Amino acid sequence: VTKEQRRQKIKARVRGKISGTQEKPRLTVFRSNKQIYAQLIDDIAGRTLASASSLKLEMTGSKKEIAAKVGDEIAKAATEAGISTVVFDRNGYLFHGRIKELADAARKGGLKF
Amino acid sequence: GSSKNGRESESKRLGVKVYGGEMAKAGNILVRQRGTVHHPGENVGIGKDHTLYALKSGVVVFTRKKNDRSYVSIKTE
Amino acid sequence: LECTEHKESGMGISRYITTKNRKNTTQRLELKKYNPILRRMTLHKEI
Amino acid sequence: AKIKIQQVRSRIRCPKDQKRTLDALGLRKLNQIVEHEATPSILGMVNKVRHLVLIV
Amino acid sequence: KTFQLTGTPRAEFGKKAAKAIRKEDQIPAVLYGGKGEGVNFIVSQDAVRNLIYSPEIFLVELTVEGSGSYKAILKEIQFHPVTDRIIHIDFLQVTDEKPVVMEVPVVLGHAEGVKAGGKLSLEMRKLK
Amino acid sequence: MLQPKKTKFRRQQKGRMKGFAQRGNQLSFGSFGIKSLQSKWITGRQIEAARIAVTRYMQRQGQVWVRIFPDKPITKKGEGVRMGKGKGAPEGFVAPITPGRIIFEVEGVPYEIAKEALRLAAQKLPVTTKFVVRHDYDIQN
RNA sequence: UAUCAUGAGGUAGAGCGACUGAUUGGAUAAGUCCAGAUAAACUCCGAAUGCAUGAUAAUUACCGAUGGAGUGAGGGCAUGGGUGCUAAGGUCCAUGUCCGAGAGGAGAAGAAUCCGGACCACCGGCUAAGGUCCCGAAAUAAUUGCUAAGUUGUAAACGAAGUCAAGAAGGAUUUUGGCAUGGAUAAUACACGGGCAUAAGCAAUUUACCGAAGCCGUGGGAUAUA
RNA sequence: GACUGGGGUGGUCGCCUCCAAAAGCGUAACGGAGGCUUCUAAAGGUACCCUCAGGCCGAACCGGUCAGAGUGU
RNA sequence: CAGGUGGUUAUAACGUUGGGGAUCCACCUCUUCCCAUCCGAACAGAGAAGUUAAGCCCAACGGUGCCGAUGGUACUGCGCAGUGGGAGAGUAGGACGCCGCCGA
Numbered sequence: 005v006t007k008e009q010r011r012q013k014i015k016a017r018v019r020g021k022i023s024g025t026q027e028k029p030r031l032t033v034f035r036s037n038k039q040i041y042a043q044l045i046d047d048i049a050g051r052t053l054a055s056a057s058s059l060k061l062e063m064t065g066s067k068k069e070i071a072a073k074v075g076d077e078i079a080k081a082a083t084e085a086g087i088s089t090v091v092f093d094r095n096g097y098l099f100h101g102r103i104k105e106l107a108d109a110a111r112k113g114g115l116k117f
Numbered sequence: 118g119s120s121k122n123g124r125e126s127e128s129k130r131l132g133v134k135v136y137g138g139e140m141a142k143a144g145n146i147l148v149r150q151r152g153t154v155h156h157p158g159e160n161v162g163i164g165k166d167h168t169l170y171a172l173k174s175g176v177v178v179f180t181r182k183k184n185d186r187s188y189v190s191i192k193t194e
Numbered sequence: 195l196e197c198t199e200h201k202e203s204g205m206g207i208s209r210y211i212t213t214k215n216r217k218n219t220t221q222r223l224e225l226k227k228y229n230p231i232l233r234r235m236t237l238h239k240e241i
Numbered sequence: 242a243k244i245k246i247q248q249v250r251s252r253i254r255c256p257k258d259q260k261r262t263l264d265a266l267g268l269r270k271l272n273q274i275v276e277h278e279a280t281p282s283i284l285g286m287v288n289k290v291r292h293l294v295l296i297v
Numbered sequence: 298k299t300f301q302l303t304g305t306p307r308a309e310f311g312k313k314a315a316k317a318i319r320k321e322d323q324i325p326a327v328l329y330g331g332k333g334e335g336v337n338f339i340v341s342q343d344a345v346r347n348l349i350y351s352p353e354i355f356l357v358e359l360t361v362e363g364s365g366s367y368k369a370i371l372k373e374i375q376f377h378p379v380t381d382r383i384i385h386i387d388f389l390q391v392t393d394e395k396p397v398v399m400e401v402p403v404v405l406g407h408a409e410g411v412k413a414g415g416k417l418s419l420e421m422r423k424l425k
Numbered sequence: 426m427l428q429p430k431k432t433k434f435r436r437q438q439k440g441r442m443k444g445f446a447q448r449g450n451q452l453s454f455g456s457f458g459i460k461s462l463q464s465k466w467i468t469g470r471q472i473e474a475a476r477i478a479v480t481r482y483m484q485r486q487g488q489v490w491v492r493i494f495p496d497k498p499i500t501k502k503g504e505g506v507r508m509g510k511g512k513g514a515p516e517g518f519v520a521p522i523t524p525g526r527i528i529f530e531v532e533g534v535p536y537e538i539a540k541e542a543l544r545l546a547a548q549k550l551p552v553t554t555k556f557v558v559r560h561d562y563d564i565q566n
Numbered sequence: 567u568a569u570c571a572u573g574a575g576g577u578a579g580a581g582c583g584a585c586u587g588a589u590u591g592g593a594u595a596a597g598u599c600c601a602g603a604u605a606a607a608c609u610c611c612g613a614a615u616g617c618a619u620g621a622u623a624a625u626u627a628c629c630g631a632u633g634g635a636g637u638g639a640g641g642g643c644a645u646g647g648g649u650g651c652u653a654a655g656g657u658c659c660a661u662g663u664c665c666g667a668g669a670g671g672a673g674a675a676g677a678a679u680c681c682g683g684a685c686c687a688c689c690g691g692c693u694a695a696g697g698u699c700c701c702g703a704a705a706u707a708a709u710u711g712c713u714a715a716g717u718u719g720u721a722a723a724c725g726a727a728g729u730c731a732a733g734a735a736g737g738a739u740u741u742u743g744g745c746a747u748g749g750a751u752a753a754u755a756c757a758c759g760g761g762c763a764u765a766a767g768c769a770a771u772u773u774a775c776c777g778a779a780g781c782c783g784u785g786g787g788a789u790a791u792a
Numbered sequence: 793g794a795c796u797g798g799g800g801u802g803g804u805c806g807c808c809u810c811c812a813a814a815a816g817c818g819u820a821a822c823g824g825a826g827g828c829u830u831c832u833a834a835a836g837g838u839a840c841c842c843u844c845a846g847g848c849c850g851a852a853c854c855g856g857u858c859a860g861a862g863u864g865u
Numbered sequence: 866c867a868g869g870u871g872g873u874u875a876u877a878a879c880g881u882u883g884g885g886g887a888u889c890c891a892c893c894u895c896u897u898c899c900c901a902u903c904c905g906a907a908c909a910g911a912g913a914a915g916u917u918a919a920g921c922c923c924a925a926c927g928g929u930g931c932c933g934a935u936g937g938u939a940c941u942g943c944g945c946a947g948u949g950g951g952a953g954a955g956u957a958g959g960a961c962g963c964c965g966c967c968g969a
């Protein structure tokens with residue numbers, strides 16, 4: 005059982021309940037062994053409204069603070085695009101750790117959810 | 118001699134009640150079924166006995182997806 | 195061994211009627227249920 | 242654009258839907274003639290009762 | 298190893314047309330394979346003698362009146378269940394390339410030989 | 426007597442035989458055979474009598490295939506029994522056949538011996554029959 | 567009712583190396599492989615019809631509420647089935663239809679097979695099914711074949727092939743078609759309804775004609791809509 | 793007491809499922825087959841996380857090919 | 866040069882052969898804290914020691930799956946196979962996906 009399929013099953017389970025529209029877009033997160041990527045998606049159109057990542061962003065050496073910086077950045081980008089309400093998508097990851105910091109920072113920013 | 122048979126239960130009147138293309142009001146029953154012969158889709162709810170009903174008002178749509186899975190949805194407005 | 199069970203201790207009074215297997219659950223069943231008289235959740239116990 | 246349809250055989254022992262098709266065409270007696278604009282619905286009626294009628 | 302056959306063109310299709318064709322003692326036949334669309338035609342029960350025959354007579358040269366001339370082999374034959382009469386013949390057109398697999402009669406370890414017309418890959422026939 | 430070793434259901438509804446046989450109408454496994462021209466229920470006793478005839482002929486040479494198998498149970502009521510009160514007593518198995526179905530096949534004997542043996546077998550069957558030979562057969566040798 | 571548009575099917579058929587039962591040969595107890603094959607309670611498939619909704623078209627009585635009922639022993643035929651023995655003028659369902667509650671015509675005579683739904687009168691005409699030698703209305707009409715058995719004009723396995731065609735292999739052999747022939751059979755006296763007919767039989771084609779209470783014509787009423 | 797291919801004897805009488813049922817629903821027989829007269833304080837709710845059964849290799853464990861298992865009845 | 870996330874019912878899947886790597890993904894290194902299982906295998910965290918070996922992506926391959934004509938046949942509506950509807954299997958063949966948005 006590859007970790008890819010293990011996460012694909014959980015992704016299907018999460019999408020079974022969570023879907024994004026122009027209002028309340030889906031906030032999906034990709035982790036990888038380094039960096040972290042955040043995307044704001046309107047699912048009925050299949051079109052991304054906002055995005056943020058840590059590829060060109062570096063402030064500390066620890067992924068938790070880097071994820072917090074990404075969360076602040078995506079909150080800023082969403083509020084500039086005119087987004088106030090979202091629904092979080094785990095994207096097959098347990099809601100704990102770097103993704104938890106990202107979501108908490110996005111809460112400290114805008115994105116009332 | 119005698120026969121050991123002769124029993125049968127009442128028929129349950131299952132099946133599709135509102136076909137694709139028809140207009141359905143909210144709360145109308147679309148399908149009576151045992152299990153999910155047809156799965157609920159957009160604006161369609163499923164009850165305890167797997168009865169499919171409309172959550173809005175619109176036109177009933179039957180669609181087929183992967184593994185020939187049948188979905189019943191409601192297109193509104 | 196399955197029988198009617200009455201939950202009580204309301205405030206008239208608040209009652210709930212359920213079932214249980216007495217051999218499986220010899221001890222008295224006690225659950226928190228909504229109390230219509232007090233409009234809050236109170237502990238009901240089998241009489 | 243118009244056809245004349247004459248009933249040439251009896252409707253006795255014919256199915257009720259064929260009898261109702263004769264009624265919808267307007268044929269209620271033998272050798273009666275009706276004139277209709279040859280629309281697809283009229284032609285489908287004539288096809289349904291073709292063994293009872295004649296196009297004159 | 299070369300049969301000759303000629304075909305009357307066929308343009309009517311269906312149970313009615315096939316019945317009309319067969320009433321006057323002829324067989325509907327189709328030819329397909331390779332490039333180009335298929336050819337529908339009519340042959341005669343007397344004209345077919347490669348069917349009631351011991352050997353696998355490859356290289357049926359067909360001249361269709363409405364079409365050109367082709368070299369094919371027998372691909373499928375339909376028989377009537379009760380009368381055992383021939384009701385339909387389908388021919389596969391063999392080309393220079395694209396080898397065609399067929400059945401070749403066996404004598405005692407022998408064969409009839411398929412090198413020309415068809416390329417190779419002969420399976421067997423009456424392998425008892 | 427041919428009959429299934431085990432069966433899921435003891436009784437069967439008496440169905441209907443409709444048209445021509447679209448399978449088993451062509452000589453496979455053999456060179457000569459006999460096809461039915463009627464629709465009937467063939468019993469195991471008839472099949473065994475016909476096979477005994479075709480095997481007593483041909484001497485010990487050749488091979489014989491029987492291509493139908495009786496797997497339809499039938500019942501009979503019995504004398505003095507009125508209509509109703511369920512199914513009667515089981516009375517064996519039958520094979521339902523329609524015209525075109527090949528019943529018997531032979532291989533390994535000359536044309537005349539095959540024709541005579543299949544005639545003998547066909548005379549013990551309850552259906553009129555047609556004798557057939559494979560179309561690529563060579564009349565000599 | 568028809569047409570068009572849209573939708574869900576699991577029947578007929580088919581298939582099973584898609585499953586579950588049954589299963590036949592093999593090439594190598596077990597398994598693989600090849601091949602052949604089966605099913606109301608098998609399905610990898612899957613029609614024709616039917617059904618639901620909407621819009622057009624043609625065409626007449628479809629729903630609300632109220633007053634009065636009768637019926638709740640059905641039957642035959644065709645089709646799809648169960649049961650029975652793929653028996654019954656048998657029995658149990660389904661879909662139509664007719665008798666019931668329906669007269670008239672043909673079939674010799676027959677509840678529901680074939681034609682056809684009777685307001686009354688007529689010493690008028692055209693037709694249906696079916697017929698045109700006499701009983702008995704209308705062709706001893708026209709043309710071309712077949713039958714020799716009065717077959718006909720209203721049962722089989724299995725023989726011989728009597729005759730006429732259409733062929734195939736090589737005067738003989740063999741195959742496919744039409745019509746006859748044997749198999750063919752109980753008790754008051756028999757049958758094409760009868761006479762009788764070699765066509766006045768069978769197959770085909772044509773033209774006239776006969777033929778009902780059907781249709782039209784003439785006179786006379788009645789019941790509803792406009 | 794009734795049903796009942798006369799009546800009696802025998803069997804049956806309410807509910808559930810399949811087939812008979814003719815691809816919507818419905819549809820009979822003393823037609824063909826089986827069940828029920830309960831159970832679970834978790835076998836209910838929710839968040840999260842898992843995946844049976846079978847064949848082979850090695851010696852309950854390892855390995856990789858694979859809807860058959862379960863869902864109290 | 867690979868990443869993320871979607872639509873289209875595998876013509877899209879599986880597989881075999883071959884090739885990648887400054888970063889992108891991944892394998893990989895260690896369990897102090899968050900967290901987890903008899904087991905840091907999975908889950909979770911810490912930042913860069915080495916690898917394209919495997920995942921992943923690309924290319925060729927018609928191999929296993931998948932799709933699939935035309936013609937014919939089965940079946941079937943019209944109370945006659947006269948007039949309409951028309952499979953399944955099989956055979957020709959096809960197919961190693963096609964369309965979006967974001968980031969580099």
Ligand SMILES: [K+]
Nearest residue numbers: 640641658659
């Ligand atoms: K009745």
Ligand SMILES: [K+]
Nearest residue numbers: 673674720759
């Ligand atoms: K008579």
Ligand SMILES: [K+]
Nearest residue numbers: 936937951952
């Ligand atoms: K076809």
Ligand SMILES: [Mg+2]
Nearest residue numbers: 126127128129
């Ligand atoms: Mg039921």
Ligand SMILES: [Mg+2]
Nearest residue numbers: 443578579580
């Ligand atoms: Mg069938």
Ligand SMILES: [Mg+2]
Nearest residue numbers: 637638639640
């Ligand atoms: Mg009564």
Ligand SMILES: [Mg+2]
Nearest residue numbers: 637638639640
């Ligand atoms: Mg009654």
Ligand SMILES: [Mg+2]
Nearest residue numbers: 641655656657
């Ligand atoms: Mg009766």
Ligand SMILES: [Mg+2]
Nearest residue numbers: 639640666667
């Ligand atoms: Mg009466």
Ligand SMILES: [Mg+2]
Nearest residue numbers: 664665667668
């Ligand atoms: Mg009547």
Ligand SMILES: [Mg+2]
Nearest residue numbers: 692693775776
């Ligand atoms: Mg006249």
Ligand SMILES: [Mg+2]
Nearest residue numbers: 698702703704
């Ligand atoms: Mg006269």
Ligand SMILES: [Mg+2]
Nearest residue numbers: 719720758759
């Ligand atoms: Mg007479």
Ligand SMILES: [Mg+2]
Nearest residue numbers: 684779780781
């Ligand atoms: Mg009159």
Ligand SMILES: [Mg+2]
Nearest residue numbers: 794795796799
């Ligand atoms: Mg009684």
Ligand SMILES: [Mg+2]
Nearest residue numbers: 813816817818
């Ligand atoms: Mg039904």
